[PDB]
Amino acid sequence: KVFERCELARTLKRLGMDGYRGISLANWMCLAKWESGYNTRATNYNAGDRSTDYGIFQINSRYWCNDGKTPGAYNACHLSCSALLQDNIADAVACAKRVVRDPQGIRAWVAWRNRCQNRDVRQYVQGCGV
């Protein structure tokens, strides 16, 4: 599923992402935008270290979900990476919250540091009714 901007903003709000661990909805929107273009099916194999990024938030298999093919990996979200490829993003959201409960918080994703951090992300949620 490729979410439309405002559709995603309201879905994320309903899921309790607005201000979760201090992270505004617009930050999550900015993150999803750059990680996948709001696409829940997006995947990216990382030939460098044998791990794969999954879903709308491009969550990595080395530590967050289990795909059985990443060496010495962990499954902190305790989900099969398949759960991160569903149209329904409830599981991906559960996992993104798990990610940010760690010290780095939203900084866990480098694309967020590159495209969202210290930027005006208000545009992401404008007119969405959130």
Curated annotation (Swiss-Prot):
Disulfide bonds join C6-C128, C30-C116, C65-C81, C77-C95. Its main location: secreted. The active site is at E35, D53. Residues 1-130 form the C-type lysozyme domain. Lysozyme C is capable of both hydrolysis and transglycosylation; it also shows a slight esterase activity. It acts rapidly on both peptide-substituted and unsubstituted peptidoglycan, and slowly on chitin oligosaccharides. One of its GO terms (cellular component) is extracellular exosome. Keywords: Amyloid, Amyloidosis, Antimicrobial, Bacteriolytic enzyme, Disease variant, Disulfide bond, Glycosidase, Hydrolase, Secreted, Signal. It is linked to Amyloidosis, hereditary systemic 5: A form of hereditary systemic amyloidosis, a disorder characterized by amyloid deposition in multiple tissues resulting in a wide clinical spectrum. AMYLD5 primarily affects the viscera, and the predominant clinical features are renal dysfunction of varying severity, and intra-abdominal bleeding. Inheritance is autosomal dominant. Pfam families: Lys. It is found in: Secreted. Its EC number is 3.2.1.17. The gene is LYZ. This is Lysozyme C.
